[PDB]
Design a protein around this nucleic acid. Structure first.
Ligand code: MG
Ligand code: MG
Ligand code: MG
Ligand code: MG
Ligand code: MG
Ligand code: MG
Ligand code: MG
Ligand code: MG
Ligand code: MG
Ligand code: MG
Ligand code: MG
Ligand code: MG
Ligand code: MG
Ligand code: MG
Ligand code: MG
Ligand code: MG
Ligand code: MG
Ligand code: MG
Ligand code: MG
Ligand code: MG
Ligand code: MG
Ligand code: MG
Ligand code: MG
Ligand code: MG
Ligand code: MG
Ligand code: MG
Ligand code: MG
Ligand code: MG
Ligand code: MG
Ligand code: MG
Ligand code: MG
Ligand code: MG
Ligand code: MG
Ligand code: MG
Ligand code: MG
Ligand code: MG
Ligand code: MG
Ligand code: MG
Ligand code: MG
Ligand code: MG
Ligand code: MG
Ligand code: MG
Ligand code: MG
Ligand code: MG
Ligand code: MG
Ligand code: MG
Ligand code: MG
Ligand code: MG
Ligand code: MG
Ligand code: MG
Ligand code: MG
Ligand code: MG
Ligand code: MG
Ligand code: MG
Ligand code: MG
Ligand code: MG
Ligand code: MG
Ligand code: MG
Ligand code: MG
Ligand code: MG
Ligand code: MG
Ligand code: MG
Ligand code: MG
Ligand code: MG
Ligand code: MG
Ligand code: MG
Ligand code: MG
Ligand code: MG
Ligand code: MG
Ligand code: MG
Ligand code: MG
Ligand code: MG
Ligand code: MG
Ligand code: MG
Ligand code: MG
Ligand code: MG
Ligand code: MG
Ligand code: MG
Ligand code: MG
Length: 244
RNA sequence: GUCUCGCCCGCCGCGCCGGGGAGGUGGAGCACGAGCGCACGUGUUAGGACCCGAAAGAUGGUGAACUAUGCCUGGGCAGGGCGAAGCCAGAGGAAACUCUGGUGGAGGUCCGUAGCGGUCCUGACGUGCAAAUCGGUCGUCCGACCUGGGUAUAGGGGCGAAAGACUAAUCGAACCAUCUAGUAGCUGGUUCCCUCCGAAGUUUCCCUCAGGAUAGCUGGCGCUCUCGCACACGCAGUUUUAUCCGGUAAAGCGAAUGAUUAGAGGUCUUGGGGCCGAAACGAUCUCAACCUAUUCUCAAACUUUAAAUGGGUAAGAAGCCCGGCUCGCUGGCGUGAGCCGGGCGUGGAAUGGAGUGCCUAGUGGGCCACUUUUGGUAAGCAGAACUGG
RNA sequence: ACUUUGAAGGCCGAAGUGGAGAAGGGUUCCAUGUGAACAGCAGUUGAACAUGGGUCAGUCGGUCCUGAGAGAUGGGCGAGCGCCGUUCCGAAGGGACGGGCGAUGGCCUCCGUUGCCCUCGGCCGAUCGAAAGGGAGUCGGGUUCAGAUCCCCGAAUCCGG
RNA sequence: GUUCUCUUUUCUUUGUGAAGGGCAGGGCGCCCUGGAAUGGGUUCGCCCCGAGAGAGGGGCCCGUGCCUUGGAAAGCGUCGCGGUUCCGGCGGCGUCCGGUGAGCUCUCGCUGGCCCUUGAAAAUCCGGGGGAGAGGGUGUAAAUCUCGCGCCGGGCCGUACCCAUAUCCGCAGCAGGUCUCCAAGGUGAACAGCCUCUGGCAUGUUGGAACAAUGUAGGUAAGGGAAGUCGGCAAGCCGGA
RNA sequence: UAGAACUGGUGCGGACCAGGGGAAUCCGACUGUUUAAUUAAAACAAAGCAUCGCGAAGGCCCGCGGCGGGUGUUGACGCGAUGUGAUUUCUGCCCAGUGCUCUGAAUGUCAAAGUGAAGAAAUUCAAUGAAGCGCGGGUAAACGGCGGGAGUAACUAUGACUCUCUUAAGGUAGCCAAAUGCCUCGUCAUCUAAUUAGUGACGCGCAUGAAUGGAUGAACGAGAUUCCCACUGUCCCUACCUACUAUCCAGCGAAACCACAGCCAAGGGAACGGGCUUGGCGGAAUCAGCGGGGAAAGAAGACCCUGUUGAGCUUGACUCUAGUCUGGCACGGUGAAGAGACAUGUUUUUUCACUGACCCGGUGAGGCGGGGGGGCGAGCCCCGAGGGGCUC
RNA sequence: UGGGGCGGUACACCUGUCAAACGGUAACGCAGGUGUCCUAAGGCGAGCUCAGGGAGGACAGAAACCUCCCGUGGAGCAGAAGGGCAAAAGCUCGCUUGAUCUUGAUUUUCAGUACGAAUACAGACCGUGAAAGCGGGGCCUCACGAUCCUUCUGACCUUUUGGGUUUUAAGCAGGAGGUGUCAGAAAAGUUACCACAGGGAUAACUGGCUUGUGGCGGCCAAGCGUUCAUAGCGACGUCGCUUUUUGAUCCUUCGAUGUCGGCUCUUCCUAUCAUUGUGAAGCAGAAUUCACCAAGCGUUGGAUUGUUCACCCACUAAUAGGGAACGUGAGCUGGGUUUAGACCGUCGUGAGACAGGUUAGUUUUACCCUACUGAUGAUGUGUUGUUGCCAUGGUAAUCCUGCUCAGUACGAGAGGAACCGCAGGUUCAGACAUUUGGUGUAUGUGCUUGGCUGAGGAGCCAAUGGGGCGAAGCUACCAUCUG
């Protein structure tokens, strides 16, 4: 046959990302003495729009504990913040919107964002537009804590992971329809080369296994085993249900 | 060498050494050696293999100056129509609000130039201006827009708003060189003369039916003999004299098997749309069949009978006769076969020189006519026997 | 008939059949002469043939910077020519400086200096990459068969020492 | 230039660079007094005001425009001289007043709208901040994020012409294709189409004679009006305000 | 810009510029894209709708190779993979078949290595026993599929009703002689002088039917069809005109093709001759045309057959393979509990904990653990109230 | 393989016939069979009689069982058919296991090779019979399979590698495990995106032979026709022609004969629709029906449909049938069919198929030879001219209406003709332009838009600026003349 689409994406060179106009990488500042034991202060300067994203980004400025210099960080913004706000980071912080502190000092039932998965990954989880995690249960024996994620899954992590307090800005976006095509075009043009999906049935059987026929039809069951090879692993993968 | 019955020998150490006869048998063997080397010719093969002839497969490499798509950075697009929110004023209303007149200038909106494209004329040209042009008529024209240059992706791979489309006039797998004189049961071609002999298209086997092997048909090279050499035997798409074989033509059914017509003597006899009647075998008919003697017609898969043409043997010296020997075979005594030694030549017609052995090519698609003959309405149709072309 | 000069009649109609340039071409440019060949007829003509001549910069462009991206070192992998990868498993800059120490040739005054002892040192990755992006500062007049923001005249200006 | 009749007529020509100094003119999200409703000011539109409007007086930026130095000597237009000529030659005049615009183009500013799009980086240069570090004596201090004036230099490579119905690619002087700048008069809504001036050309690889047939491109037709034909195919009607 | 008079042989957007309309059905919502050089379409795309996997030692994928690389300067309002196709109004039953998926020691089967008995030893035997296949559940906006006979209503005909045989269910709401109906030019109405056409109705539908999407319905279409008004040389029926040619002359000057050649009837023949046979007949060299023949030119017929010649594509053909699931040996170390088969200790094993090989992330490798010199303080003990012990 | 595919097996075997009297002999020729069955249905000996038919006998009947007579096979012998068999080869009883071990020869098919099957002998061991003798499978004709590999049986059997012993392995001889495509490969589809070497040894058009089917026509004559075989029809039967129907065949053509239908144009046939000249009726008149000579002149306008065919409207003397490579594509068109894209239904798991439907889709070349039409010229006559004759060839005129004859003849009536005459028309043909119309660049004369020659006048430019009237000429059943 011939190699198909999808099997061409994993090599890159035409399906790569478009990163000329992106401003940086969002991540929470590193761990150090002050943030481990005490706290530290910083100030917001401006709020900005990052392409390829829905969540706006803050700019925070800190005073370096060891040199006569200043140090800038590019956080992801909770909902409520503004310029001129003082932002306090670390263990001795007060529980209010915009600050950063650990999990095992928070109470139950509280909201967070830009959470960490392991202690010092600078922030990985719950960092999209309108989402938030939630604290559930502590365990001062063994230093563990459980967290609800926006997929509806309960997950265990430590009590030294850091996190940011509050929902994320951009909240409520998929409740606007797009109505046109060229609003989609300017969307994905800033992210990837991916938008027009040609249906497999309108192909020929060289370049897709569902292709061909005098009619348009699939001909075979659209579910497929997890361990099928590349080229055939298309459709409803490992489906344990179909319908609704 | 190999089975079957067997009685014996020699050896300083007797076995699980060695020897006879034959029912007999398996062998590319013996029996008074013929090869070895050199050259020439023909023939069958393996090699580029008489010459030219593919679609294709592998190894290694050049290409995105056309086109497909993504990114970087720069440029470009008359004049007009409809009139969304928002704003002002006047009038009405108890209020919420409403009516009328302006302003404003949004929109993958409308008409239309530049530009980008490419519907119809199924027009022109159709050895052209042109390996895809020209003319008028067309489509869209603030936007999923048009475009320059730079940069990324390379061949069972790339890119694709998908048509199996494009990838340097080439794409249902590019091009360049080599492997490579790839293979071909298949087409086309194969170079001077005279003489001589002179065919087949048929059998059996083959994943065989456009082809090969096998036998047959043909040629060449010989060799053993003999004759008008006063001096003979042997042969034959032939006739004759004797003698066997056959079941086809015709004929036959008052003879078997099978089929079939009609009336005379049988209610033979079952029963009657019924029959004169209580009906019966009292009668009286008959019918599907049915006893006796006769009658008309039939047979590729029936036959008592039985040709014409045909096939096979025989027509003498390898015969006849006389006498005697050998035999585990057979046995009243004897038969049979084999060996020995002697005596007796024309054995129906008409013809002519016979026999034997190696090498060996081309063929292996057939066709017609009398006569016989199968299928088919018939055929310049299809399939066979005889002879001749 | 076709060159040239004059006169007359006509077309292009400023999104041009006009005046200048990029890519590409490469002497085709300018004068004198020729009429074999070529210019699908002709030619006293020619972008043809022959012989000669012609492109002048502190200020116009390159050169400098980086862009998408390409690409060495260390390291890793690989039969092997080599390939991956660009801050990633690296003692990664010779960077400089104020002070002290003996020396230095010039009238060792002032120096740089080969040399150290000190002394502050991050950067964070060699290099390449656009004659349309970014990037100090020149204008008018005149002059040739053919050259001018370059030659001559006259008025200015940037950088460095 | 026209004048046979008219035409105070029609046509052409009628200027000052770079770099400075001064001033018009536009813009300000700049300051000082002062305290606003009977709410005011104000744009085509918007829009603004005790977080200080209107009204008064001030400051800053751009000032491609006018004046001035350049610079009238030079250039141009006319009427005349000399040099045989081999001449940037010599003279006499002039190089002037005003005005309108939904006018076209180029530019500078103000302001608003659209975006699940938010619209490059680096070389290089600059100012500020405690003064770190210090440095130097009444005539010194050397840097200097510098006042005016003589000085010295500024290397290498390209630069001719064509840029297209004849210098490029298409085998060719091929009706094809190939990125940009400048852009007048009239009609008209208009860079539509029709005629003209500046500048360019000789009809697009040849000419003369005559007007048969069939062609190709254009047109017109009495009366009827799709009866034609697979099919109103092609042509024709309507057409702007 | 609006109005009035007068004037012209009704001519007046006077040239150029410059929309034919109307009534209806089928498809696709629209704008957009598309087979360069025969197809611009009803085909692709879209917005909207719905499912599917995934919480990073991950999902999808690349790769000869590696602390390799893309999505990823990412984190479920996201990334990847699939089908339908705006809105409105709806989305019916079947888990028997096939696929997918969950668990599972409690059950057959099930390889290497390992365990044990016999043998002089190769060897043989036995017990053991992973994933997978079977055993069992869930799923149809997953591939897909969704029936026959007979009797029956006070005139006939129909047949609401009843019976019956089997299937995983036996076609629901809608719609139809359609771009889907063989029999077929189905039947009835209308349009027409006349209609195999077209519109509206009927429906035991060879073979319609529900995201393999059903039914509708404004605007748009270089889309496919029927009719009407105005219009016309499309036609009755052809004619006239103008330009460039063709034609003649001067000058320059090719090609394809070509056995030999070039008047007919009939006859026979490889059955349709320019040439043969029997008859007809036969007179130099040429000019403009036209298209009957030359079975006229081009391209070793793509239709059909054969070939023990090929290639593209698919799968339940045959033989294999990358990748991937799983068991075993090595890298593999420390300690502690529990329980075993033989036989009267052996190793085995399940579990818990450790770190030093190994792996991961972060950083300009910037303040780790104990300790009390700490002390601003607190609460717990002794407490000379002065001390030190504990929690911080 | 009477083209291939679907079907069948004529692909290994048996009987009868065809097959032409030895033997042998073909076709998808006729009729049928096989891939088995048997511890006896094999083998020896002995004894007996089959099918059926008749006559009798308690229940007893068409048929149970008993007895007698006739009985040439008319019954049986495993299966298909054929042959053969009576104190058997059949039925029944007794005993057994020649269905065993071993060489070689021959026959059948045939090359004169193999398998298989069969025959006659020889050596052994045996069985049955009193014994002669018979028996090494089934009364005869068919019932089955190589190398290589594996497994089993056998001999105090050879080798296992420098010698010896034991195990294993290899060898020798004989059975079995199997190839049905049966003298013996290990094996699924699709291509409309397709390709190559060849083929008229082989198909889809014409042509050619045949004429079943289709069409047309004769013979004899039972009945129809109230009566009356034959005015006109004609059963049951039978003899023929034609190639405008569809088949059968496969001779030419596969290095190419351009494949449906309409448009256009010419010629030919007759099996006569009408018109001319005539005959016959169940012909009073008028209309109609059968037939003869005859192919001269005619046979139309339209809705539907791609149409050939069909069907309806309207007029007409009439609305007849055919051909020529199923006339005619360097003459048109390209609607359909018959490439490439695509949509529905049915089938296939699927790529894909449909003899089902629907939409969009490149139609080349003449300047050669001939023929055909027109145009110059040529031979000879001494040269040249004027006037003329004729061979030979073509060939052209055709139909209808009206008034009169006449509301006459005829006929009961209703109704209803014709011959000569007069005037006019249709289709065709040949010229012509007095008059009407059309053309119009005489670029003739006015009018008018935009622009340009300073303006007026006179003029030009806009591939014929537009528009109005229009001479000569060319032209029309759209005007006229003639046959
Ligand atoms: Mg799609
Ligand atoms: Mg497709
Ligand atoms: Mg596939
Ligand atoms: Mg299906
Ligand atoms: Mg050879
Ligand atoms: Mg070759
Ligand atoms: Mg191969
Ligand atoms: Mg390139
Ligand atoms: Mg096209
Ligand atoms: Mg055309
Ligand atoms: Mg032509
Ligand atoms: Mg030309
Ligand atoms: Mg396709
Ligand atoms: Mg060769
Ligand atoms: Mg041959
Ligand atoms: Mg062959
Ligand atoms: Mg006979
Ligand atoms: Mg031979
Ligand atoms: Mg120029
Ligand atoms: Mg120019
Ligand atoms: Mg250039
Ligand atoms: Mg010339
Ligand atoms: Mg020149
Ligand atoms: Mg550089
Ligand atoms: Mg630049
Ligand atoms: Mg103020
Ligand atoms: Mg130049
Ligand atoms: Mg013009
Ligand atoms: Mg000329
Ligand atoms: Mg030219
Ligand atoms: Mg007319
Ligand atoms: Mg019509
Ligand atoms: Mg018609
Ligand atoms: Mg039209
Ligand atoms: Mg409908
Ligand atoms: Mg559409
Ligand atoms: Mg095309
Ligand atoms: Mg929807
Ligand atoms: Mg689905
Ligand atoms: Mg459903
Ligand atoms: Mg299931
Ligand atoms: Mg229904
Ligand atoms: Mg209908
Ligand atoms: Mg119609
Ligand atoms: Mg269905
Ligand atoms: Mg469907
Ligand atoms: Mg000519
Ligand atoms: Mg002839
Ligand atoms: Mg003939
Ligand atoms: Mg010929
Ligand atoms: Mg011809
Ligand atoms: Mg061929
Ligand atoms: Mg070929
Ligand atoms: Mg073969
Ligand atoms: Mg290939
Ligand atoms: Mg399989
Ligand atoms: Mg065959
Ligand atoms: Mg015979
Ligand atoms: Mg007996
Ligand atoms: Mg017997
Ligand atoms: Mg014996
Ligand atoms: Mg050994
Ligand atoms: Mg040994
Ligand atoms: Mg197809
Ligand atoms: Mg007949
Ligand atoms: Mg044929
Ligand atoms: Mg033939
Ligand atoms: Mg034949
Ligand atoms: Mg031809
Ligand atoms: Mg021809
Ligand atoms: Mg006749
Ligand atoms: Mg024809
Ligand atoms: Mg043609
Ligand atoms: Mg022709
Ligand atoms: Mg068509
Ligand atoms: Mg098609
Ligand atoms: Mg005559
Ligand atoms: Mg005028
Ligand atoms: Mg007129």
């Amino acid at each position: 046959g011939r190699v198909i689409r999808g099997q061409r994406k994993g090599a890159g060179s035409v399906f790569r990302a478009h990163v000329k106009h992106r401003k940086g990488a969002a991540r929470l500042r590193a761990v150090d003495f002050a943030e481990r034991h005490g706290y530290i202060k910083g100030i917001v300067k401006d709020i900005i729009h990052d392409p390829g994203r829905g969540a706006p980004l803050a700019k925070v400025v800190f005073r370096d504990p060891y040199r006569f210099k200043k140090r800038t960080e590019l956080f992801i913004a909770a909902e409520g913040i503004h310029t001129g706000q003082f932002v306090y980071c670390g263990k001795k912080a007060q529980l209010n919107i915009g600050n950063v502190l650990p999990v095992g000092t928070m109470p139950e039932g509280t909201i967070v964002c830009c959470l960490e998965e392991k202690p010092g990954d600078r922030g990985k989880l719950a960092r999209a537009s309108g989402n938030y995690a939630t604290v559930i249960s502590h365990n001062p024996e063994t230093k563990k804590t459980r967290v609800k994620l926006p997929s509806g899954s309960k997950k265990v992590i430590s009590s030294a992971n850091r996190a940011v307090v509050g929902v994320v800005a951009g909240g409520g976006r998929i409740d606007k329809p797009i109505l046109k095509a060229g609003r989609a075009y300017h969307k994905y043009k800033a992210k990837r080369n991916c938008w027009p999906r040609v249906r497999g049935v309108a192909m020929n059987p060289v370049e897709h296994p569902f292709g061909g026929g005098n009619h348009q039809h699939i001909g075979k069951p659209s579910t497929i085993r997890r361990d099928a090879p590349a080229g055939r692993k298309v459709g409803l993968i490992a489906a344990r249900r179909t319908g609704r």
